[PDB]
Amino acid sequence: MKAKELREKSVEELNTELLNLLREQFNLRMQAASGQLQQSHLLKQVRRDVARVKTLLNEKAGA
Amino acid sequence: AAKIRRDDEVIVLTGKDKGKRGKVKNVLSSGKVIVEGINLVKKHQKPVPALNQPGGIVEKEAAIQVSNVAIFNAATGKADRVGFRFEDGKKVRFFKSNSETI
Amino acid sequence: MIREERLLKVLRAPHVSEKASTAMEKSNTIVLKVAKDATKAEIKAAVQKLFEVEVEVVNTLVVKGKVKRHGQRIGRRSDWKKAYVTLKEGQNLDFVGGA
Amino acid sequence: LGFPINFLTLYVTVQHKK
Amino acid sequence: FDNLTDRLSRTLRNISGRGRLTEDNVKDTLREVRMALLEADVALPVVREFINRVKEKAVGHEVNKSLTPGQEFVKIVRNELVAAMGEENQTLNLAAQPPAVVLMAGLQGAGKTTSVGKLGKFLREKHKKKVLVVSADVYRPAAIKQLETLAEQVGVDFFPSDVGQKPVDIVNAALKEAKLKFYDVLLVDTAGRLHVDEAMMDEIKQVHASINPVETLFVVDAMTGQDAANTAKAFNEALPLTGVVLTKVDGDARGGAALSIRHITGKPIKFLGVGEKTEALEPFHPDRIASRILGMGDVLSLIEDIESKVDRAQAEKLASKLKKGDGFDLNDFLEQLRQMKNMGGMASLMGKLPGMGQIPDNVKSQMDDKVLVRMEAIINSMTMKERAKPEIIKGSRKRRIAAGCGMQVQDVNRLLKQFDDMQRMMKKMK
RNA sequence: UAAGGUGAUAUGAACCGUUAUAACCGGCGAUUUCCGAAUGGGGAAACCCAGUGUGUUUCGACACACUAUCAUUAACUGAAU
RNA sequence: CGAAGGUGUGCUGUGAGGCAUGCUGGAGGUAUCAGAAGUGCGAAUGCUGACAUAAGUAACGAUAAAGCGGGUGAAAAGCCCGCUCGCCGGAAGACCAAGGGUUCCUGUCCAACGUUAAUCGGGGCAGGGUGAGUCGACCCCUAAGGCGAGGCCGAAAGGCGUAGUCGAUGGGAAACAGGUUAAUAUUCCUGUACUUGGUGUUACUGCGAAGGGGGGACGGAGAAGGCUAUGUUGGCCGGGCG
RNA sequence: UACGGUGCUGAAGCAACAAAUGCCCUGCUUCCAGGAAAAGCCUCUAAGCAUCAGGUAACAUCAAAUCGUACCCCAAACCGA
Ligand SMILES: [Mg+2]
Ligand SMILES: [Mg+2]
Ligand SMILES: [Mg+2]
Ligand SMILES: [Mg+2]
Ligand SMILES: [Mg+2]
Ligand SMILES: [Mg+2]
Ligand SMILES: [Mg+2]
Ligand SMILES: [Mg+2]
Ligand SMILES: [Mg+2]
Ligand SMILES: [Mg+2]
Ligand SMILES: [Mg+2]
Ligand SMILES: [Mg+2]
Ligand SMILES: [Mg+2]
Ligand SMILES: [Mg+2]
Ligand SMILES: [Mg+2]
Ligand SMILES: [Mg+2]
Ligand SMILES: [Mg+2]
Ligand SMILES: [Mg+2]
């Protein structure tokens, strides 16, 4: 989720940005920078996002 | 020691200018301070993959950092920074003599 | 305990070079460069599953590097890896290639 | 053939400003 | 629409949207494209059908393996775009025999006259043939007049009768004329004051069946659009051989529906012509349009010219002396130029098309054409020999060309290399 | 604490922020591959190999946890007698 | 309205020096008096750096010498192409180990590096390039030797060593021939094979160790025979009649 | 043909003699200085198993992981600045 928005349910489901939510990053993965069209926002906002949700788990679970 | 938000009709206590007001500013803590107070001229070489030469050189991010008096309805000077109760508290945001914001 | 396998992110973009595509003419065997700790067996499913390819057997390499960017003193290594997969002529991919 | 020949022809004209 | 033809590469994005599903990439696009249409005139009743058929397929197919789906999708998309529009029949706009009868039936004016031009215009710059035109309209003023212009201004006489309100005769008259002179192809725009379209045709009635024309055409501006349908329609019946074109492309904003409606009647087109300029007219074949994602492509065309050049130096003398003896001089370079703007050095197509195989930058096409004249500036501002030894360009010998050609130095030095480097790289054969 | 920011050579790009929740500073916490006392055996440190468990399992099997020596005690065993 | 420092000039003192001042320089400097010292070099075959000298001298690394025509290029004795010529051939060829660690191939560029020139290179900057069930290492096994629970010794450190555990240079299982890349190759492709383990089906049956036995499993020297590698001649096939 | 090379096609393709320091040969002969080890391998049984499991063979199938592989290699890539 976002910030506090993350604290809700307990299903690892949200933790699947990798599956069918990450394939997008895969394409624009070719160096030599090819893909300049407009708003080519191929910056990692998702990987940094993988944590947080990767966190909280323990918050609820253990520590 | 940042002394500008979105606009500060500054002056020029020193720097080839007398009191030319301005904008931009962008003064800070780790960055620069640019305003029309100063500007220059010399374009930089542009070999042509594409003519990476838009052309036209004047100020870019001209010098002159802090140590610049900000606007006042009257003459000049009037160092800001005082502090008020409540009214945000995210910064003293006041003024010398009488005033606060422009 | 679930197997800490990067079920998905084991590889990365395809290599791509002269050998690239020309290799594809052989058996639709494409390269793609996987991460160090790959193990072909982990690659096989990686490409076939999720990415729909239905390949069979690989190759994989390693390769290092070493250069010198700035003037003096500054140098290193870099490492990397290779892969070739295969893809039988039967099970295609409706190939994602062009010009 | 048509690609390079045409692309070099193209790349040359742009680069040479006169 | 144009900005949908972007959804095209806007689609060439492995990333995909938020949906993990990226599954929607499609439908959106669908709707997206789907939107761009009606918004741009376009009738819809139909649409459902397209959008449908579209779907239909999906749940009945898959891209033969060995090929990314995303792509396939298109073939299909494209596929139906065709059918959607002028499905498939390659219009036969050329000679059945000669000479010819171009009955130009036009609603109220609009392209009315004009059209004819590039049309005619077009064919003269095609076959040894002899055009020939006639003011076949006497209700609205500037018959010949406005038209008249071009006629000469293109090297193509025409003929009419001042004031004189009465077709037929005049027509007949004209006709046989050129004929008597034995020309090759006639074009004659006509129309009528009847407030009703059946009256329009009602006119063409005699008009047609009095003359005995071989090829007949109506036309319309996308201004009317899908509405048009009917108009034309009623007539496809009058005459099925009745093929047409749509006046003004750049002359509306609606388009689609126009051409859309058309089709959906078994309607028959042949051209379209963006609008102004004596040549903007173009042939037509769905694909062609659409070519490049939603309509016009070339170069393949502009492309194929290479072959024109590349394989022509072959053409000084193909040999004109089997060898090598040094028999010619390298100033094609500038030679390339001419061709080209002489004829076809119009932008050739140099658009680039799909950055493919490598997408590089915006000024590359993007920034010299408009302005690759310059390079020319000099050249002719220099002796032959010069360009043979493009390595004797002393500051001295050139500033004159610089000024002599009128260009302040810089420009040149600032190019001389786009010549000695071109090769450099160019010449990089193993 | 705040009108500015994504350390440096390092710009460029793509972004994040602005009259109460960017960035930055301080406290507490989370994660912390591998080698190294190195501690499961091994070993030309960053690597080779194994035993017992575990879940998933598309039920193939795999990733992870524990298994060093020694002493204090306790519990169970148990020679020559 | 030019500090220090640098370079000239004049005056001055017994002298070490002082003052004034022209030029350069771009910021500091310090009467007087008193005070504290890393307080004054030509020498120490003195330390460090810079520059001479010899001197445009010797030398340019095997005496297997090279000539010419084209190409490229600003320029070719040296690079690419070609024809000659000469040199090695138990090698001056080919393959691998050890060691090296991108030197490989392509494109480029010629400052420095090449004892000269250099368009050229093992040089610079880019890219690309090493694909295995059968080859090797891992891995079973142990040699010399090492380490070593407990243990025996020894002021401490630590030495020795039982079980045991490591340690190849040695023993254990299996693939070849064509083809192909700018560069890979018993790894990729084609054609034809093979080893071992699990699982299964079938058939027949006593299975089972860290244990017993066999076997692995081994010297030097000499004397043949047979055979293959391989060469020669003929036949055959293709080619030319100088 | 890019000048390096490429796609296609493609004859005969046998016999005789001659050899090795290679192979049969971890052999044969002989001698005194009397010439590793352990595992794999074959086999025999112990405890244990006790219509079972296992054993042998045939074939069917799955598995055979991970590193190395470029180039120099009696030398301009190693030891000698
Ligand atoms: Mg350990
Ligand atoms: Mg240990
Ligand atoms: Mg001396
Ligand atoms: Mg001399
Ligand atoms: Mg002398
Ligand atoms: Mg002499
Ligand atoms: Mg001499
Ligand atoms: Mg020499
Ligand atoms: Mg190097
Ligand atoms: Mg080389
Ligand atoms: Mg090099
Ligand atoms: Mg390998
Ligand atoms: Mg010991
Ligand atoms: Mg061992
Ligand atoms: Mg060994
Ligand atoms: Mg090789
Ligand atoms: Mg090799
Ligand atoms: Mg020496």
Side-chain angles (χ1 to χ4, degrees), chain E residues 134-402:
Chain E
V134 178
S135 181
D137 286 281
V138 288
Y139 300 85
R140 207 210 49 59
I144 296 170
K145 183 177 179 180
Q146 161 231 42
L147 97 73
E148 183 178 0
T149 300
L150 21 161
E152 292 179 0
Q153 165 265 40
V154 298
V156 163
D157 285 353
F158 59 93
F159 182 80
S161 179
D162 289 350
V163 180
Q165 284 208 175
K166 183 177 180 180
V168 177
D169 189 358
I170 180 72
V171 174
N172 288 339
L175 181 63
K176 292 180 181 179
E177 183 178 0
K179 182 178 179 179
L180 181 63
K181 294 178 180 181
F182 302 105
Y183 292 103
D184 309 352
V185 180
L186 180 67
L187 297 173
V188 214
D189 169 45
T190 180
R193 70 187 178 83
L194 296 175
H195 292 296
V196 177
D197 288 346
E198 293 177 359
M200 181 279 288
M201 180 183 72
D202 187 61
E203 300 173 285
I204 191 66
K205 193 178 189 79
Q206 182 177 7
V207 174
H208 186 274
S210 177
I211 297 170
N212 291 335
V214 177
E215 294 182 0
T216 300
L217 69 162
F218 293 163
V219 289
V220 65
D221 178 10
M223 180 183 72
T224 300
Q226 62 192 65
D227 286 350
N230 191 71
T231 299
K233 184 176 177 178
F235 150 43
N236 286 344
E237 292 179 0
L239 178 63
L241 293 175
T242 60
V244 294
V245 297
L246 300 174
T247 81
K248 285 181 269 189
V249 178
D250 304 10
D252 187 358
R254 296 177 179 183
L259 42 81
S260 315
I261 303 300
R262 292 180 184 277
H263 181 72
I264 301 299
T265 54
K267 183 71 176 179
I269 306 69
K270 303 194 157 186
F271 317 117
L272 180 65
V274 174
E276 307 191 306
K277 265 301 182 179
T278 61
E279 294 180 0
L281 159 57
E282 306 173 10
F284 167 68
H285 183 60
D287 295 309
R288 206 187 197 285
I289 296 171
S291 63
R292 300 190 180 180
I293 300 170
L294 300 180
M296 300 190 70
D298 280 96
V299 75
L300 178 64
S301 153
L302 290 175
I303 298 297
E304 219 105 55
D305 191 61
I306 294 168
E307 182 177 359
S308 295
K309 185 176 179 179
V310 177
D311 288 347
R312 182 174 181 179
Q314 183 177 2
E316 300 180 0
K317 300 190 180 180
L318 300 180
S320 63
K321 300 190 180 180
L322 300 180
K323 300 190 180 180
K324 300 190 180 180
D326 214 347
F328 52 98
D329 110 317
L330 72 119
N331 65 9
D332 266 1
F333 183 80
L334 184 62
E335 181 178 358
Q336 197 172 305
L337 181 63
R338 183 177 179 180
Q339 297 297 314
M340 294 295 100
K341 292 180 180 180
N342 180 252
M343 68 155 12
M346 293 298 291
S348 299
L349 331 122
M350 180 56 72
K352 226 270 235 179
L353 300 180
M356 300 190 70
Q358 300 180 0
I359 300 170
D361 300 340
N362 300 320
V363 175
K364 300 190 180 180
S365 63
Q366 184 63 48
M367 165 194 198
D368 13 85
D369 241 70
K370 294 180 180 178
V371 298
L372 297 173
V373 176
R374 294 292 314 309
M375 290 189 286
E376 181 182 359
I378 296 170
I379 301 299
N380 50 290
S381 303
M382 309 130 59
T383 188
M384 185 180 289
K385 202 167 179 179
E386 262 167 280
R387 289 176 291 178
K389 296 178 181 181
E391 301 181 4
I392 44 181
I393 317 74
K394 293 181 180 180
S396 311
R397 316 168 101 316
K398 182 174 71 178
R399 305 188 300 189
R400 148 214 64 277
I401 310 173

Side-chain angles (χ1 to χ4, degrees), chain A residues 13-14 16-17 19-21 23-28 34 37 42, chain E residues 6 9-10 13-22 359-360 362:
Chain A
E13 206 44 64
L14 334 128
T16 192
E17 14 286 310
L19 179 61
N20 258 137
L21 284 154
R23 184 123 294 282
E24 304 141 310
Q25 101 229 74
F26 294 63
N27 298 290
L28 267 118
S34 294
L37 198 144
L42 263 291
Chain E
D6 328 48
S9 66
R10 288 176 181 275
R13 186 177 176 182
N14 287 340
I15 294 167
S16 296
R18 289 178 181 179
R20 290 178 183 169
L21 291 173
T22 61
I359 300 170
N362 300 320

